[PDB]
Design a protein around this ligand. Structure first.
Ligand code: ATP
Ligand code: ATP
Ligand code: MG
Ligand code: MG
Ligand code: MG
Ligand code: MG
Lengths: 320, 319
């Protein structure tokens, strides 16, 4: 028994299928050549609010009249929860790290939420959200540890398994592990021979360290990574699922993330945020070569497209 | 009559369909809200080589194989890449004449697809003259980016798709450079559904098409244009001008700032990495002058013509 069940994911699908489009799966002959795999890209960047977080947000809201919804977010969960709350006429307060990209801070306010900045650490996020929840008498909807959220994210895999029936592996970027855990439950329940692989920045590598050690090891210092959506540590609800049901974790460096993100931009014309480049970098990575040649058909989740163009100017690289 | 007919477009479709993408039409609630219209975006940025030019290039190569020592053209980059790809499929060397001031991303892709690149001065005259000389030197066949009939016919296949995907469209909005796409679309639309408006969108900083229509004669750009819309610096030509004169309903000019704003809006709201030239059509629908367009012209298809953007080049203006 885990904090969600397959049944939870099925119910989540029922709860949100009238509210979100089924995002496309796209392909690139070039990326296929570069990796020597048969790649399929699940385009969550086209989801309402620009990331898959709409799934968990809609599921959580439908599963909840309350005075307000509250959460902490690097931006995507915040935008998504604000939109879902607004559908129901519920006020939203989003606790956001000071260092979040401007595009995410501005979008949250565009959708009508009150934004409250916190310090960029797990502790500050959690503590400030708890206080805001107390002060507003709101309902806290955690970005990755809330069962209704995790089950919502898992619906990605229901779609993938139908869109790509012969898939051999899903590759999933991991932060708090909400998406990874929901996908792992879904894939392992329906099609256990399909691999579930996590992709994680080296600069925020708690999930990798945790799996290696076989115990939950949160990030010690606040992470600094261009993959701004996966700075969260994994938590007590998602760790057991990841521990038991995820096949392997691949870490990728800042430079690998930057190169893979630009590659998708230039070759596929999909404006993924760098956090979504993490999964692409994983498949391009040296260690991924160790993956059996039999694992041919790989679906990478392009998890979001909320990228700060003015910020991306710092690191955009000319061909060398 | 004109240098192509609808039968030419139909034939082009037969010639190329097995080799190209039927590109999607995407939408955005936000862009609808901002413009007050119901917009349909024809996503040629997902075409092979990153723009619609694969259509004209494949058509020309398939039409003109009946093999030369080489194919030659001049291009700001998109036609160059497309022709190189089409030629490579047939084992034919490519020579592309490219203005010095073309984006690096385009210069490098042409080289990556295996062509020889020859830089020219950034003018209509230099492009045409150097391409002529290279054709003669290589004993190649010249495939013009916008005045070659097989190229015009190929580009018009966009409209065949649009009219099936968006059957009750009220207007198409099309960025114009040399007028190959505009003319091919105009021919197809006015043949199949003449009540559908065909509108061109053009940078004010390269506004020969607008000036031509305004003055009722071909008025090429007098100075080399300077515009972020790097793929529409070409003047319209002798084969496309009569089609545009007679069959295009209106031309909307847009400033550099409007192009930048519309390009970023598509990036941020729709996550489609259009090049700024493809932003020209979006900026037109957002422009003050487009507000003079009747409210009954509500359902509008904009051609997102390419996605070949130089991100290093974009740093200067991205804000
Ligand atoms: N004010 C804003 N500032 C920055 N980004 C914004 C702003 N408003 C919306 N966005 C971004 O625009 C993208 C699209 O938003 P959203 O999904 O709400 O609209 P849409 O794409 O028009 O909707 P649909 O595709 O369902 O018609 C998201 O990535 C969102 O973050
Ligand atoms: N070396 C390169 N430098 C920059 N851009 C490149 C380079 N090679 C290819 N591109 C760009 O990559 C994009 C995709 O290229 P292309 O259509 O040939 O392949 P693909 O997208 O992998 O193919 P498909 O979608 O049919 O599987 C195009 O915009 C092209 O300009
Ligand atoms: Mg492609
Ligand atoms: Mg981590
Ligand atoms: Mg959208
Ligand atoms: Mg012009």
């Amino acid at each position: 028994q885990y904090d969600i069940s397959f049944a939870d994911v099925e119910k989540a699908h029922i709860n949100i299928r009238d509210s979100i489009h089924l995002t496309p799966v796209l392909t690139s002959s070039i990326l296929n050549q570069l990796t020597g795999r048969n790649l399929f890209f699940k385009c969550e960047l086209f989801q309402k609010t620009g990331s898959f977080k709409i799934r968990g947000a809609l599921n959580a809201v439908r599963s909840l009249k309350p005075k307000a919804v509250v959460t902490h977010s690097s931006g995507n969960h915040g935008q998504a929860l604000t939109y879902a709350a607004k559908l129901e006429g519920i006020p939203a307060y989003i606790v956001v790290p000071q260092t979040a990209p401007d595009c995410k801070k501005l979008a949250i306010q565009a959708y009508g939420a009150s934004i409250v900045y916190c310090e960029p650490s797990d502790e500050s996020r959690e503590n400030v959200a708890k206080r805001v929840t107390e002060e507003t008498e709101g309902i806290m909807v955690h970005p990755n540890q809330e069962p209704a959220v995790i089950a919502g994210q898992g619906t990605i895999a229901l779609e993938v398994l139908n869109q790509v029936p012969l898939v051999d592996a899903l590759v999933v970027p991991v932060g708090g592990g909400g998406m990874l855990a929901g996908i792992a439950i879904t894939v392992k329940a329906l099609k256990p021979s399909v691999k579930v692989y996590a992709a994680e920045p080296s600069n925020a590598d708690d999930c990798y360290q945790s799996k290696l050690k076989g115990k939950l090891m949160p990030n010690l210092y606040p992470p600094e990574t261009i993959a701004d959506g996966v700075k969260s540590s994994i938590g007590l609800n998602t760790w057991p699922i990841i521990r038991d049901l995820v096949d392997d974790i691949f870490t990728v460096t800042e430079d690998e993330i930057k190169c893979a993100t630009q590659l998708v931009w230039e070759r596929m014309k999909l404006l993924i945020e760098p956090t979504a480049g993490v999964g692409v970098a994983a498949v391009l990575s040296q260690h991924f070569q160790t993956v059996s040649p039999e694992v041919k058909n790989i679906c990478i989740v392009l998890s979001g497209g909320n990228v700060d163009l003015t910020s991306s100017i710092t690191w955009v690289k000319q061909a060398e």
